[PDB]
Amino acid sequence: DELYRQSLEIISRYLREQATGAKDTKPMGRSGATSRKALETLRRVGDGVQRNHETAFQGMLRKLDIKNEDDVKSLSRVMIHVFSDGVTNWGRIVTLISFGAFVAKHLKTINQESCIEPLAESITDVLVRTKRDWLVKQRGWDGFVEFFHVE
Amino acid sequence: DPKKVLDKAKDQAENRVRELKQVLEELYKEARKLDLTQEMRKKLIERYAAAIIRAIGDINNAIYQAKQEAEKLKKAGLVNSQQLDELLRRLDELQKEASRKANEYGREFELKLEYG
């Protein structure tokens, strides 16, 4: 399943980088190209939504109260509610991922770093399993990179 | 022309923020009336987080949709590269001015849950 493999890599890595502060140096699937460009995009845009909505996000993180791994299953319910009006766009998508990064930073500060991969598997699983055809029609992560590109 | 791009973005943002407010109002009106089990509180907090993520996602999407609309006009030389920059600046201003409303309502609701 290529799209799942590629989506997990990107999401998983962004969450780890964000939690730690240290950028991976391991080799992706794409040496020079799509997974790399997607990660670069996600850093620019997703770092932006975190700065610009720090207040809203802290508020949510405090009340969802993500102590442990049971509570990580409750982010899925959040994602499903988000999409439940029928609308799917990249804005919604990047914002979920950026909220995922915000909670990954938080888990690291409570020494629940081992819940970061499950969190990322879980964002990916919702996104791909429920919007697969939409993602493919948008040209996948190539479309993501194109939609947010600024030059 | 550039004004219709920016005007569109402005409508989208305004409506998305209006929608966010309505949703959080309706949510409070049900949280107050009901006797909240631990479960029903958990559900209500999940709906609030979703409402916020939805609004922030749609604003963001409106703004970068307008970035695409502007970037297209430039390849159809229908805007000179200064007019492009007045647009990308007023979009950036719009983004900030909508992000501040999302944060405001997020917190207002957050206090209604602790205190109100």
Numbering used by the authors:
A (entry chain A): 172 to 322
B (entry chain B): 2 to 117
The authors write:
Pro-survival homologs (six in humans: Bcl-2, Bcl-xL, Bcl-w, Mcl-1, Bfl-1 and Bcl-B) are structurally similar, but oppose apoptosis by binding and inhibiting Bak and Bax, as well as sequestering pro-apoptotic BH3-only proteins (BOPs). Interactions between BCL2 members are mediated by an amphipathic, helical BH3 motif that recognizes a conserved hydrophobic cleft present in the effectors and pro-survival proteins. Here we describe the computational design and experimental characterization of specific, high affinity protein inhibitors for all six pro-survival BCL2 homologs. As confirmed by biochemical analyses and X-ray crystal structures, the designed proteins engage the BH3-binding grooves of their specific target pro-survival BCL2 family members.
One design, M-CDP04 (subsequently called αMCL1, or anti-Mcl-1), was highly specific for Mcl-1 and bound with picomolar affinity. The crystal structure of the αMCL1•Mcl-1 complex at 2.75 Å resolution reveals how high affinity and specificity were achieved. When Mcl-1 in the design model is superimposed on Mcl-1 in the crystal structure, αMCL1 crystal and design models closely align, highlighting the accuracy of our design calculations (2.1 Å average RMSD among the six separate complexes observed in the asymmetric unit; the N-terminal end of αMCL1 in the crystal structure lying slightly closer to Mcl-1 than in the design). Though the design model does not place αMCL1 near enough to Mcl-1 to make these interactions, the design calculations selected residues with long-range electrostatic complementarity. The BH3-mimetic helix 2 of αMCL1 has three additional helix turns beyond h0 and h4 that have side chains close enough to interact with Mcl-1. These extra contacts, combined with those made by the peripheral helices, expand the classic BH3 interface by 534 Å2. (C) αMCL1 computationally designed residues E111, R108 and N104 complement nearby Mcl-1 residues. (D) αMCL1 residue 46 was redesigned from glutamate (BINDI scaffold) to isoleucine to accommodate the hydrophobic Mcl-1 binding pocket. (E) Designed residues R42, K43 and K44 promote long-range electrostatic complementarity to the negatively-charged loop region of Mcl-1. αMCL1 residue E47 (borrowed from Bim) makes ionic interactions with Mcl-1 residues S245 and R248. (F) Designed residues K68, Q69, and E72, and Bim residue N62, make polar interactions with the Mcl-1 backbone.
